[PDB]
Symmetry: C3
Subunit: 225 residues, 3 copies
């Protein structure tokens, strides 16, 4: 079960990479070329890292607990680019953009330590810290990020509402899967945990990538002379 | 002894993080929001890494020698932000800013290898190399950095004198502690070495952070219309 | 044989570092100071990493196969700066510059996994992936990169022709050495493989660095008023 869902992730990310790369090659406009290129690399990074996991790499048995630590490499590299999708679209200021990237990096870093710690009490402490880092990004996204975006695009508040709603709902699912998996309560087996993360990853990457392109199109139409 | 001083570092860095974060949230002005945000992340990174050390993590017994290798992660991430405090305040040029960040990264990288090498002869070679990297940053700071700062703020030469004096004196203490600790002569025990680095870290981070804010205030008063 | 060629690399890189550093210290002009500084750090990074290899570090016996994994650290840090030599000279756009840096990072990252994988079938898969990442950079260099450079310097198409010819020919030699060495067919012994990489590294770093300076001089003469 786990093995097929890793290959489904390879396929899904590779397809996202091809279609974003084609969009990048045929962009009209530097802004469009940038946005296609960000999403190309989100999906291209995830393709290679899903390929390593599918081939059996990036995994260690830590005190009896199978642990796919390479998952946190993918997340550390791709989540900042998703943040950049948002801040590129919202024309976010430099301090708020840096704060989002830093709090996000803090979340993935502490989530990684939460995962590879042999002492699961210590790991669960790091889980809580990582949740507070996520909550920091929630605060920044629904306050300073949102208000700048709505000031920059007064006619497209609904666009950023949908982007933020999809981002917040999807990203909140990751710490739930983490608690269900063998990092937490072990309420679901490894095949199910892997299926969950594969579906989340394809949705938060390919799915969010296509939503970012559709948002760009709406913003540019609302901004034509 | 070592254990309490790691917790003192957690407390000190967390307090610095809270007060710099509060300053960031209430900044008037993008320049002030940037400077508060740099110092927030300096202290927030150090808080998490001090928490890992306090919990017993980030440590390895290398050929019989207890070695807190995670100390070099904290330093690799936080020292460039301290460099940025300086170059942000001095409005340093891009080549000099990159040279300071690169020489600094070289220093921490070679200091890390100097520390984890089992062969302490090789480690001591890397210590010397790291000292020359530090000396490179000294040269850049008291020449090109200082002269640009004084050209940018002709009325505030004393401000950069104090910043540079505190930076140079404090940062020179780290290679002295390193020679005293079990990386070198082992003239002081691990509790004392840990106390020294905790006091240095709180001073060079929280202390220097507050000095950078006070300097900003002096520069802005000297620069009001 | 391997040992002397590692020391030859130390010497060659150190000499390149000194002469690029002297150029940086005596630059007239921010553009010249930037270009000297990029090449200084290319060679300074390679000096330190060649010193680690010469001292016997950065090497692991992976399932019976001696593997100098630190070679990929040098490459991950220095190859983006060589890309920057090119994009600095060509005044390349942000999306094309990011795509070159990302595809290049992808190449070195997958080349590293291709090297440290114990399963050499999996390693050879990663070799192919890394070759396609290289081919991606070839496509970007001879299409978008070249066309922007020739649009920016209509009178100096030959300058970018020589830069690209040297870059493409030299960099193609690395995957050939990799196939000849103990990562592939093991057709040459470790001393010969090390000699090959040392000569390639000195040429692609010091040699290309001096070519980038000579190109800058030609571009500036073709651009004087
Ligand atoms: C613990 C979380 C650490 C990561 C940072 C969370 C807090 C944050 O980002 O604070 C923003 C504020 O504006 C100050 O920079
Ligand atoms: C294992 C997991 C299996 C899971 C199967 C899910 C099948 C679909 C169900 C609900 C999906 C709803 C997605 C709707 C997105 C709507 C959107 O983009 O935004 C609307 C919103 O109101 C903006 O504020
Ligand atoms: C803020 C976040 C709160 C998370 C609340 C839960 C954090 C603690 C998780 C505990 C856990 O995973 O417990 C495993 C269980 O004991 C089986 O062995
Ligand atoms: C050995 C130290 C290596 C790190 C760099 C030290 C020398 C340096 O920074 O030189 C500046 C100069 O302007 C050229 O770039
Ligand atoms: C374990 C270690 C224990 C250590 C206990 C230290 C107690 C205080 C002693 C001296 C501190 C002096 C700090 C003075 C800073 C002054 C300053 O900010 O700058 C002045 C300077 O003249 C600008 O050029
Ligand atoms: C320039 C820097 C010079 C540092 C001078 C000292 C560098 C060498 C340190 C030697 C050392 O630590 O020696 C340990 C001692 O032999 C106990 O075993
Ligand atoms: C596999 C190689 C992955 C690295 C990226 C290669 C493809 C590439 O760079 O595509 C450029 C295009 O413009 C879209 O961004
Ligand atoms: C182990 C390996 C030993 C290897 C010994 C090599 C000795 C020299 C042979 C050929 C070198 C030729 C280099 C010519 C570079 C020319 C150049 O810079 O560009 C010209 C080109 O036509 C622009 O398009
Ligand atoms: C595109 C790149 C093609 C590389 C073609 C070759 C890629 C495969 C290399 C195979 C290899 O190294 O084989 C070792 C040999 O079997 C001794 O044990
Ligand atoms: C792989 C992605 C990692 C992202 C790390 C993000 C780190 C964020 C740190 C924030 C502090 C810097 C705030 C802005 C500094 C601006 C400096 C300047 O303007 O000179
Ligand atoms: C975590 C922090 C690490 C800091 C690393 C710093 C590396 C410094 C390297 C210097 C070489 C680059 C010099 C300036 C390049 C400008 C490029 C351009 O203008 O296109
Ligand atoms: C050590 C060097 C590593 C280099 C990594 C390069 C990663 C390349 C990734 C490309 C995606 C980003 C494309 C441009 C984003 C611009 C963002 C913006 O303008 O706000
Ligand atoms: C493209 C390659 C896809 C390979 C799919 C293999 C699936 C094997 C399995 O899990 O049963
Ligand atoms: C970053 C890379 C970390 C690689 C190793 C992480 C998992 C360690 C597992 C173990 O120690 O058993
Ligand atoms: C905030 C948490 C602080 C915890 C302090 C524990 C100190 C324990 C000790 O070292 O004796
Ligand atoms: C960067 C991370 C390096 C992590 C490991 C460093 C210490 C190694 C200690 C040992 O090998 O015993
Ligand atoms: C500068 C130091 C150079 C040291 C050269 C040592 C070569 C030793 C050898 O390989 O025989
Ligand atoms: C990045 C750093 C990776 C360091 C280790 C790479 C080689 C591992 C060799 C081994 O596991 O035997
Ligand atoms: C429509 C123009 C022709 C297509 C140009 C781009 C084709 C390649 C796109 C990138 C694919 C990379 C996949 C990595 C996984
Ligand atoms: C802004 C960038 C943030 C990067 C990371 C921030 C701090 C993370 C704190 C946790 C680090 C713990 C390291 C533990 C190492 C040993 C694990 C076993
Ligand atoms: C096996 C018992 C524990 C189950 C794991 C609970 C994980 C968190 C559930 C959150 C519910 C949605 C919000
Ligand atoms: C566009 C695609 C977005 C993702 C949809 C869900 C994918 C699930 C894959 C099994
Ligand atoms: C004065 C306005 C209210 C305070 C806003 C900011 C409060 C939180 C500051 C950040 C704390 C993070 C600590 C990490 C350790
Ligand atoms: C400008 C960025 C500088 C980054 C690092 C520069 C070069 C450091 C040289 C020392 C590297 C040694 C690596 C040894 C690995 C094995 C240790 C045991
Ligand atoms: C502001 C505080 C600066 C640091 C002072 C020294 C802290 C020592 C802690 C034990
Ligand atoms: C001509 C002016 C005097 C020389 C200034 C620069 C001298 C040092 C150059 C850097 C050397 C670093 C070598 C690292 C290996
Ligand atoms: C744009 C930046 C690219 C960074 C890397 C891209 C993806 C690399 C894909 C390969 C990663 C494999 C990791 C395997 C870990 C275990 C090895 C044994
Ligand atoms: C021992 C038999 C295999 C030799 C290795 C072949 C490596 C590739 C040669 C490429 C030729 C130039 C293009
Ligand atoms: C300028 C020097 C460029 C490199 C030439 C070849 C060096 C070979 C060293 C053995």
């Amino acid at each position: 079960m786990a093995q097929i869902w890793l290959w489904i992730g390879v396929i899904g990310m590779a397809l996202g990479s091809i279609f974003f790369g084609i969009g990048a090659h045929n962009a009209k406009n530097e802004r469009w070329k940038i946005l296609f290129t960000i999403n190309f690399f989100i999906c291209a990074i995830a393709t290679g890292l899903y390929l390593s996991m599918a081939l059996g790499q990036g995994r260690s048995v830590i005190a009896g607990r199978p642990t796919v630590w390479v998952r946190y490499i993918t997340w550390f590299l791709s989540t900042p680019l998703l943040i950049l999708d948002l801040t590129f679209l919202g024309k976010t200021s430099l301090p708020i953009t840096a704060s989002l990237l830093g709090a996000n990096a803090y979340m993935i870093a502490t989530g990684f330590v939460a995962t590879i710690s042999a002492d699961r009490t210590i790991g669960h402490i790091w889980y809580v810290v990582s949740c507070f880092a996520f909550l920091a990004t929630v605060y920044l996204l629904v306050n300073q990020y949102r208000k700048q975006a709505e000031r920059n695009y007064p006619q497209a508040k609904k666009v950023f509402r949908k982007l933020l709603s999809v981002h917040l709902v999807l990203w909140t699912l990751y710490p739930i899967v983490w608690l269900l998996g063998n990092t937490g309560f072990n309420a679901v087996n490894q095949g199910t945990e892997t299926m969950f993360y594969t579906i989340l990853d394809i949705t938060s990457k390919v799915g969010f990538g296509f939503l970012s392109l559709n948002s760009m199109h709406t913003l540019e139409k609302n901004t034509e002379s």
